[PDB]
Enzyme design. Sequence first.
Site, PDB file in Angstrom:
ATOM      1  N   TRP A  77       0.655  -1.184  -0.157  1.00  0.00           N
ATOM      2  CA  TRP A  77       0.133   0.054   0.038  1.00  0.00           C
ATOM      3  C   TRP A  77       0.695   1.339  -0.024  1.00  0.00           C
ATOM      4  O   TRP A  77       2.106   1.302   0.545  1.00  0.00           O
ATOM      5  CB  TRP A  77      -1.125  -0.214   0.910  1.00  0.00           C
ATOM      6  CG  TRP A  77      -2.141  -0.816   0.818  1.00  0.00           C
ATOM      7  CD1 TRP A  77      -2.198  -2.253   1.328  1.00  0.00           C
ATOM      8  CD2 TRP A  77      -3.299  -0.501  -0.123  1.00  0.00           C
ATOM      9  NE1 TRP A  77      -3.439  -2.799   0.906  1.00  0.00           N
ATOM     10  CE2 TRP A  77      -3.980  -1.871   0.087  1.00  0.00           C
ATOM     11  CE3 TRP A  77      -3.879   0.612  -0.502  1.00  0.00           C
ATOM     12  CZ2 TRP A  77      -5.314  -1.826  -0.635  1.00  0.00           C
ATOM     13  CZ3 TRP A  77      -5.134   0.334  -1.074  1.00  0.00           C
ATOM     14  CH2 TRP A  77      -5.770  -0.657  -1.252  1.00  0.00           C
ATOM     15  N   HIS A 130      12.719  -3.146   6.887  1.00  0.00           N
ATOM     16  CA  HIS A 130      11.304  -3.560   6.224  1.00  0.00           C
ATOM     17  C   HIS A 130      11.128  -3.711   4.765  1.00  0.00           C
ATOM     18  O   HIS A 130      10.539  -4.180   4.338  1.00  0.00           O
ATOM     19  CB  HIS A 130      10.213  -2.832   6.842  1.00  0.00           C
ATOM     20  CG  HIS A 130       8.780  -3.160   6.247  1.00  0.00           C
ATOM     21  ND1 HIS A 130       8.213  -4.416   6.313  1.00  0.00           N
ATOM     22  CD2 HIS A 130       7.855  -2.491   5.604  1.00  0.00           C
ATOM     23  CE1 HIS A 130       6.916  -4.483   6.052  1.00  0.00           C
ATOM     24  NE2 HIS A 130       6.768  -3.146   5.442  1.00  0.00           N
ATOM     25  N   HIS A 178       5.296  -7.305  -1.517  1.00  0.00           N
ATOM     26  CA  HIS A 178       6.094  -6.590  -0.389  1.00  0.00           C
ATOM     27  C   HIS A 178       4.912  -6.246   0.721  1.00  0.00           C
ATOM     28  O   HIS A 178       3.878  -5.930   0.338  1.00  0.00           O
ATOM     29  CB  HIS A 178       6.519  -5.488  -0.988  1.00  0.00           C
ATOM     30  CG  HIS A 178       6.982  -4.481   0.284  1.00  0.00           C
ATOM     31  ND1 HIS A 178       7.923  -4.915   1.169  1.00  0.00           N
ATOM     32  CD2 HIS A 178       6.364  -3.673   0.866  1.00  0.00           C
ATOM     33  CE1 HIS A 178       8.009  -4.037   2.229  1.00  0.00           C
ATOM     34  NE2 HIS A 178       7.256  -3.287   2.084  1.00  0.00           N
ATOM     35  N   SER A 179       5.115  -6.924   1.823  1.00  0.00           N
ATOM     36  CA  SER A 179       4.408  -6.394   2.857  1.00  0.00           C
ATOM     37  C   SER A 179       2.920  -6.901   2.444  1.00  0.00           C
ATOM     38  O   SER A 179       2.592  -7.992   2.294  1.00  0.00           O
ATOM     39  CB  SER A 179       4.551  -5.132   3.418  1.00  0.00           C
ATOM     40  OG  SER A 179       3.882  -4.895   4.803  1.00  0.00           O
ATOM     41  N   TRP A 203      10.005   0.648  10.573  1.00  0.00           N
ATOM     42  CA  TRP A 203      10.565   0.275   9.335  1.00  0.00           C
ATOM     43  C   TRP A 203      12.033   0.446   9.143  1.00  0.00           C
ATOM     44  O   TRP A 203      12.912  -0.603   8.502  1.00  0.00           O
ATOM     45  CB  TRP A 203       9.628   0.750   8.067  1.00  0.00           C
ATOM     46  CG  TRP A 203       8.415   0.145   8.102  1.00  0.00           C
ATOM     47  CD1 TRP A 203       7.815  -0.672   8.776  1.00  0.00           C
ATOM     48  CD2 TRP A 203       7.371   0.798   7.353  1.00  0.00           C
ATOM     49  NE1 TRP A 203       6.472  -0.855   8.559  1.00  0.00           N
ATOM     50  CE2 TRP A 203       6.127   0.226   7.446  1.00  0.00           C
ATOM     51  CE3 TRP A 203       7.538   1.882   6.399  1.00  0.00           C
ATOM     52  CZ2 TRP A 203       5.150   0.303   6.908  1.00  0.00           C
ATOM     53  CZ3 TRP A 203       6.159   2.195   5.676  1.00  0.00           C
ATOM     54  CH2 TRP A 203       4.936   1.435   6.131  1.00  0.00           C
TER      55      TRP A 203
END
Length: 274
Positions: free
Chosen positions: A35, A250, A99-100, A159
């Site tokens: 996001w 992160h 990612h994430s 992060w």
Amino acid sequence: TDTYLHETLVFDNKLSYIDNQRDTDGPAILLLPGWCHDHRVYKYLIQELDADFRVIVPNWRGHGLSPSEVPDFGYQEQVKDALEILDQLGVETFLPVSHSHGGWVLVELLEQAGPERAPRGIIMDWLMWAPKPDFAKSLTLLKDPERWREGTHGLFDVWLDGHDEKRVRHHLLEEMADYGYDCWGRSGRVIEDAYGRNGSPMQMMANLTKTRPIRHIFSQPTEPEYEKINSDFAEQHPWFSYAKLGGPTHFPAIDVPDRAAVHIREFATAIRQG
């Protein structure tokens, strides 16, 4: 690398995407942003893979070099967008790499596209457990129009994890600086809704109609209790593996791109031998 940047109309919306158009053996590598950022998070990763694979990176609605307000949507929509871009491109078989919180897209993509089209998946740095209080709080702040920026600043703290990591800072402070409350507030409600309704990433993955090889590659959280939920899930599930990459932030796609590439290749090569 903007030399691979394109724009197409996808149902209602114009979406940008990366596609190096490499003419090579499959599978294609679908790099999936999380996001409120875009393809720029993958620019080093793209470099590592560019020669030997076709590399596609879709940008979500309202995402790109020029972010814009768009109507509300969630991961189910992100999945339809991704598949529609794949149809237009004539791409059949793909290895998705998220990612994430792009992971929610990846796992629903695996489900909807199924194991012949999408036989494996790689998830990068995605909080495997249900939100702990500090993350639950960050989500709370992102959803609040009075405190969203404070929300993002606390996430940037987590992060970067006390590192003066020049590339990651550049991504957060420059490459995400144009994203506003329409994105961040949405990210907040969609992610909070996603945990609420699927339990967790692991619950969602275990619940796939057709389970298949998924690897979690991550650098944080750094604590042994986090490695343990990953080792315990992997003991319980033959199709699950993980690798702790030991990078500073992160964002392994940025700060250890060679390492992320090596796991993507491995999974690409496994698809190439049936």
